């Protein structure tokens, strides 16, 4: 009598109606999760999980460092960052044994790209921290400023245009005692410690964005990790949709069908939330050194620079804080540079406690965070570690009646464990839990569940009895990209086609997307169909065209003609789709090369393609 959509599941199995539980399917308008207190809590938790790790004082940045590796083994189920180097190396060795040569081929096939990439490759990317201006900036302008400053400071080897040359230039600049920054004329002298702390910065508006001196090394290490993952089957990256869908079915078939009827199989789905706390750059450096065994030393240095630099990473602290006095109706803002020495009476209990915890780390308005990682820079290496842990589960390594396998993608994991009895299943799951704890892999027991094999999910790819329900992508914008008629039409139709091909977009939904596309395009460009009664200035001349043409379907949609696109015919260019139907006189007028208007996407060079003023 009163609506209750959840009750739909009372007859429909949940896996079918999973889209019911995705409230947004878009980008919300609030942007909750960025600021300063979040950084405070992140640093505090990172250093808390390493509570018993050894403390030391850095010699270059002059900031404390925490090393939890090889620390005491955890005694409780709470998260532990005590990852043992020997266990990690043994796991990597076992992975190599099961997949001989993998690291060798990865290294030798990546050396070329290490020696081939150009400087401009760094231009592509997300926002970057500009040490020159001390604020997040576009990658291209940051690169221009960096080359300008280095040229001023007499470091012009990067002029060769090779990425490795620029990395050597960065090394030389970092070795220099001090440098000059000229802003427009204001000159700033950054000493060795100042420049070093700036270069190891992690700005926070991939939540964290490193500086520019660390881009190339991160790129190289991620390239090696991707190359290693490619040969790995359990790795969930960098495959697309269809292959990811097939991975789940293949794993289930391998684990279940081969097993005897007597044997019992179970599957656990688990989420590794807050996955960067317990993984340290030092363990990554260890695995990197292991990977490049018996390899040229220059390549080893280039590849190991990244985790070495990250282990001394400095984390910036938001923009600051905002205080308000209701009594006097006043508002003020304080920066993070003054948060080191300031009263704690303004803040509340939790905020003042966090400030108390993080006070002894703020160096020059930038906390020091050696342990733990930051989101979205070394994801592939984490996937490599996960697949190694999984590979350690074969029947030969386990040396037990039970066994297990599964998939890991560094954000979600699924594990199928089978054994002759229920006690066998319990033993298998417990042993996997402990083994993954030893390496520092943390399984959240409050967001994981176990059930008989057949039904589970992984990276939102919900799986039920051989059926996958990929929901890992959001719907893009079906609007006017704002270049020109033909350009916008082509890019948008290609966008919808591509989303149909891979992102698993239903046909009917694609049809409504095309409908809304046509609506928005006509509204924006004021090119409405001649038959429609809508009125505008452009409709006058447009109307004339509708009368002149002998074939309505020949006219381009931008010219007021009908939209003949559909699921079957989406890849064809709009101009080419109406080539024959277009009247000969219209064809000649439209594509006249001598037009005065003209002095990626697939489109024809018609007169409708102009550059906006």
């Amino acid at each position: 009598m009163d609506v209750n959509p959840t009750l739909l599941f009372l007859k429909v199995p949940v896996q079918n109606a999973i889209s019911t539980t995705f409230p947004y399917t878009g980008d919300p308008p609030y942007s909750h999760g960025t600021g300063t207190g979040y950084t405070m809590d992140t640093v505090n938790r990172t250093h808390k999980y390493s509570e018993k790790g050894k403390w030391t004082t850095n010699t270059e940045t002059g900031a404390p460092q925490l090393n939890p590796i090889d620390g005491p083994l955890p005694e409780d189920n709470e998260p532990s960052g005590y990852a043992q180097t020997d266990c990690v190396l043994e796991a990597m060795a076992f992975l190599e044994e099961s997949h001989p040569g993998i690291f060798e081929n990865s290294c030798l096939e990546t050396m070329e790209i290490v020696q081939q990439t150009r400087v401009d490759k760094l231009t592509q990317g997300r926002q970057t921290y500009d040490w020159t201006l001390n604020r997040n900036q576009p990658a291209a302008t940051a690169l221009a400023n960096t080359i300008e400053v280095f040229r001023s400071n007499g470091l012009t080897a990067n002029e060769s245009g090779r990425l490795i040359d620029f990395l050597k230039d960065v090394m030389d600049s970092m070795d220099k005692e001090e440098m000059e920054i000229t802003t427009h004329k204001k000159k700033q002298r950054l000493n060795k410690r100042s420049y070093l702390i700036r270069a190891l910065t992690l700005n926070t508006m991939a939540i964290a964005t490193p500086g520019m001196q660390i881009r190339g090394f991160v790129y190289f290490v991620e390239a090696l990790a991707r190359s290693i993952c490619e040969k790995l089957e359990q790795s969930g990256l960098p495959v697309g949709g269809n292959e990811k869908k097939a991975k789940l079915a293949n794993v289930v078939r391998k684990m279940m069908t081969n097993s005897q009827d007597t044997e019992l199989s179970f599957t656990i789905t688990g989420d590794n939330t807050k996955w960067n706390e317990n993984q340290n750059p030092r363990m990554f450096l260890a695995m990197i050194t292991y990977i490049t065994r018996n390899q040229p030393e220059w390549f080893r240095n280039v590849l190991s620079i990244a985790p070495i630099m990250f282990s001394n990473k400095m984390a910036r602290l938001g923009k600051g804080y905002m205080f308000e006095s209701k009594s006097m109706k006043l508002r003020t803002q304080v920066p993070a540079e003054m948060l080191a020495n300031i009263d704690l009476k303004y803040f509340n209990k939790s905020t003042r406690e966090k400030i108390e915890k993080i006070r002894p780390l703020l160096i020059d308005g930038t906390a020091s965070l050696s342990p733990g990682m930051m989101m979205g820079m070394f994801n592939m290496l984490s996937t490599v570690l996960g697949v190694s842990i999984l590979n350690l589960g074969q029947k030969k390594y386990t040396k037990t009646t039970y066994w297990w396998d599964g998939l890991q993608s560094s954000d979600d994991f699924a594990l199928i464990v089978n054994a002759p009895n229920h006690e066998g299943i319990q033993a298998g799951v417990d042993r996997f839990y402990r083994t993954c704890k030893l390496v520092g892999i943390n399984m959240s027991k409050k967001k994981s569940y176990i059930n008989r094999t057949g039904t589970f999910e992984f990276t939102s790819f919900f799986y039920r009895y051989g059926f996958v329900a990929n929901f890992s992508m959001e719907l893009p914008s079906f609007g006017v990209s704002g270049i020109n008629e033909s350009a916008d039409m082509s890019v948008g139709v290609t966008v919808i086609k591509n989303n149909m091909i891979n992102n698993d977009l239903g046909p009917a939904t694609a049809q409504m997307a095309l409908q809304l596309f046509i609506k928005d395009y006509r509204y924006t460009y004021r090119c409405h169909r001649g038959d429609t009664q809508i009125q505008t200035r452009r409709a006058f001349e447009l109307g004339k065209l509708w009368e002149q043409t002998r074939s309505k379907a020949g006219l381009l949609v931008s010219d007021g003609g009908p939209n003949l696109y559909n699921i079957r015919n989406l890849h064809i260019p709009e101009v080419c789709l109406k080539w024959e139907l277009m009247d000969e006189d219209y064809q000649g007028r439209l594509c006249n090369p001598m037009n005065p208007f003209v002095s990626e996407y697939d489109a024809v060079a018609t007169t409708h393609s102009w550059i906006p003023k």
């Binding site: 919300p28 190359s227 030893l438 569940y449 008989r452 039904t455 009125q535 003949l564």
Partner: protein, 707 residues
């Protein structure tokens, strides 16, 4: 130069080259010679692996391709194929990615083309790669050809054809007058020794980045290089604490309990506009002079009413400015009359700055700006009130809101353009599904809300970015089509924006919104806490006892919106797409099990019953139409009430739903930490009414399913 390559080489080969160079992130425009080199390499590889097949007996036949391309695909596919081939045939794993694989010979072959002499290229390639059981095919434009062991898998005809292709290509470059550049660009890629030394600061940093019990990076490198595992994992596990374990709690039917809802004062409406209680001043068919302009439409809609009274406050804004709302409403009416008195009315009219206008907007209540140095010594100077809002109990008004949002309206709220014809049977199925769903939902209130929000937000954004320092007036207009087929134009109220000097997308613009209504706010006053209620007229409504007079209320409220929120509210059309996606996914899920397109009996059958509600006698079902309307209403509610709380609750409760589902199918499920999941879910039920109603739905489903 690239034009010649594009026009001569076939589209497929150039597309493959473009994909390959896009994988490596190299722009073709900057590197011209390498473009031609890669195109030629791919072409020669494909020709080497073209028109060659293996018969069923094993002999070589020319018409199972004899040659399989490995370099014509991406890295992942090539690696998978070569791994499978090696595992099946037990062949030594290649170090690199081979160009081609010969099935008859069951061996990997590499293709090489060079501008200079073939012998140097073969020598360097063999020294670089050839170590054991490897074959390379080397060709050149000079017409000289050679290979390994003088063995050519290709016959004489194919070799001659490839030589002719190379010769005609070379003649083309020579005619174009650019072969000299092509030859000079080749240099053998001199592999001078590469040196990368860590020194100075970096050496210190590296030495300070090792595990415990290590003094320098070199010691660790030596240790790991000589490392070989020996039962370390077993020893650590034996010495690991026994208490650490991921125990499985037997999950039976009796274990789950309903989510504990918060206690406190009831909730309150917080939407940008009224949903159940909106009122419309409508003109059936706008045919007046000067159409399209929102101001004239608003004036005409206003002129249709004559029940204006003297405004007075019935339900005042407790924590706010009550009188100034009345004063600004009076100012709005007087300004509209003044506009009526005009002759050459411009497109829009900006309200003059007045005390009541500023006070209602909040301009005179906005704290000023001053550096922290000059205000540190303030007794009550505190950090912004980042305190968790107080808990609010569940209120029944949100249930009624959703119920009325799911009802069937009597107008065509959404108008969609046309597309091409459908020829494929799958196109027929897609069109059928889309048309059925659209006919179902095009008359639902959710579409009315969508269009109202879109119009309000687009008008507000245009006004904000048009005049920066003017307090413009903006009618809340919505155009629809009745069942009969007359273009109805409804006006719900008015909005006045504040100063709109916007530099950042998150900059907040303050506006004051006045919305008509006919609901007595003394029935459920708690629902109305942010609003000021005036009684600005009386309306005559027809009932079984004639034309009865009832009060006409006005809800005035000061709100603020950000440009990104404005765009979010301007892009609500995607709710229809989401609701479709949902119903289509359910269609596919039910069809796959039966293995047949089931939309025909899903929609037209009218014999299916999907539980969609509850009644005093028990649960209640509906129709696929009710299901579609419910899903669209849910999507629109989620869009309007966008908050992190909603997404958090949905994400944390999806897992509980999945576990209950697994329980239903007798899958013997188990939970490592059920109480932790319960706390994580309940962490999102504090004050929001939408999330509280969702939790109530979840509890109802829990108590029903397990029975």
């Amino acid at each position: 130069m690239e034009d010649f390559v594009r026009q001569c080489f076939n589209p497929m080969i150039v597309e493959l080259a473009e994909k390959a160079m896009k994988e490596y992130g190299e722009d073709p425009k900057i590197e011209t010679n390498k473009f031609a080199s890669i195109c030629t390499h791919l072409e020669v590889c494909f020709m080497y692996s073209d028109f060659h097949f293996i018969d069923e007996r094993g002999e070589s036949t020319i018409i199972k391709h004899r040659f399989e391309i490995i370099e014509g695909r991406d890295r992942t596919m090539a690696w998978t194929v070569v791994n499978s081939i090696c595992n099946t045939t037990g062949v030594e794993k290649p170090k690199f990615l081979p160009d081609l694989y010969d099935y008859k010979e069951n061996r990997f072959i590499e293709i090489g083309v060079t501008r200079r002499e073939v012998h140097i290229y073969y020598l360097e390639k063999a020294n670089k790669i050839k170590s054991e059981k490897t074959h390379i095919h080397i060709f050149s434009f000079t017409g000289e050809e050679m290979a390994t062991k003088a063995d050519y898998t290709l016959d004489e005809e194919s070799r001659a054809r490839i030589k002719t292709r190379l010769f005609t290509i070379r003649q083309e470059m020579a005619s174009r007058g650019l072969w000299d550049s092509f030859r000079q660009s080749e240099r053998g890629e001199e592999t001078i020794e590469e040196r990368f030394e860590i020194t100075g600061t970096m050496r210190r940093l590296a030495d300070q980045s090792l595990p415990p019990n290590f003094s320098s990076l070199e010691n660790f490198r030596a240790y790991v290089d000589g490392f070989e595992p020996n039962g370390c994992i077993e020893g650590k596990l034996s010495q690991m604490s026994k208490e650490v374990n991921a125990r499985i709690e037997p999950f039976l039917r009796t274990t789950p309990r309903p989510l504990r809802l918060p206690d406190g004062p009831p909730c309150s409406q917080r939407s940008k506009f009224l949903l159940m209680d909106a009122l419309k001043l409508s003109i059936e068919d706008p045919s007046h002079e000067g159409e399209g302009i929102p101001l004239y439409d608003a004036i005409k809609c206003m002129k249709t009413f004559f029940g204006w009274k003297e405004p007075n406050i019935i339900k005042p804004h407790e924590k706010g400015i009550n009188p100034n709302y009345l004063l600004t409403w009076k100012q709005v009416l007087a300004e509209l009359q003044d506009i009526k008195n005009e002759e050459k009315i411009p497109r829009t009219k900006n309200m003059k700055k007045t005390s009541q206008l500023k006070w209602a907007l909040g301009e005179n209540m906005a704290p000023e700006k001053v550096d922290f140095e000059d205000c540190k010594d303030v007794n009550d100077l505190k950090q912004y009130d980042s305190d968790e809002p107080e808990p609010r109990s569940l209120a029944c008004w949100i249930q009624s809101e959703f119920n009325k949002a799911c009802e069937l309206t009597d107008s065509s709220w959404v108008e969609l353009d046309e597309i091409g014809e459908d020829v494929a049977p799958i196109e027929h199925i897609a069109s059928m599904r889309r048309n059925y769903f659209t006919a179902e939902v095009s008359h639902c209130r959710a579409t009315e809300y969508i269009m109202k929000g879109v119009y309000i937000n687009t008008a507000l954004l245009n006004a904000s970015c048009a005049a920066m320092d003017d307090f413009q007036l903006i009618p809340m207009i919505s155009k629809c089509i009745t069942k009969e087929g007359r273009r109805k134009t409804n006006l719900y109220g008015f909005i006045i924006k504040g100063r709109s000097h916007l530099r950042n997308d998150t900059d907040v613009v303050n506006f004051v919104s006045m919305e008509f209504s006919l609901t007595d706010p003394r029935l459920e006053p708690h629902k109305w806490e942010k609003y000021c209620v005036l009684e600005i007229g009386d309306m005559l409504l027809r009932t079984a006892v004639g034309q009865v007079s009832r009060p006409m209320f006005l809800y005035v409220r000061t709100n603020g919106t950000s440009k990104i929120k404005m765009k979010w509210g301007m892009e609500m059309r995607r709710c229809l797409l989401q609701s479709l996606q949902q119903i289509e996914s359910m269609i596919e899920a039910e069809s796959s099990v039966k293995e047949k397109d089931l939309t025909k009996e899903f929609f037209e059958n009218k014999s299916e019953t999907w539980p969609i509600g509850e009644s005093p006698k028990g649960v209640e079902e509906g129709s696929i139409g009710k299901v579609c309307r419910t899903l669209l209403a849910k999507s629109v509610f989620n869009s309007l009430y966008a908050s992190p709380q909603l997404e958090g609750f949905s994400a944390e409760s999806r897992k509980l739903l999945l576990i209950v589902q697994a329980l239903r199918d007798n899958l013997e499920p188990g939970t490592f930490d059920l109480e932790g999941l319960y706390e994580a879910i309940e962490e999102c039920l504090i004050n929001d009414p939408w999330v509280l109603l969702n939790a109530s739905w979840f509890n109802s489903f829990l108590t029903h399913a397990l029975r």
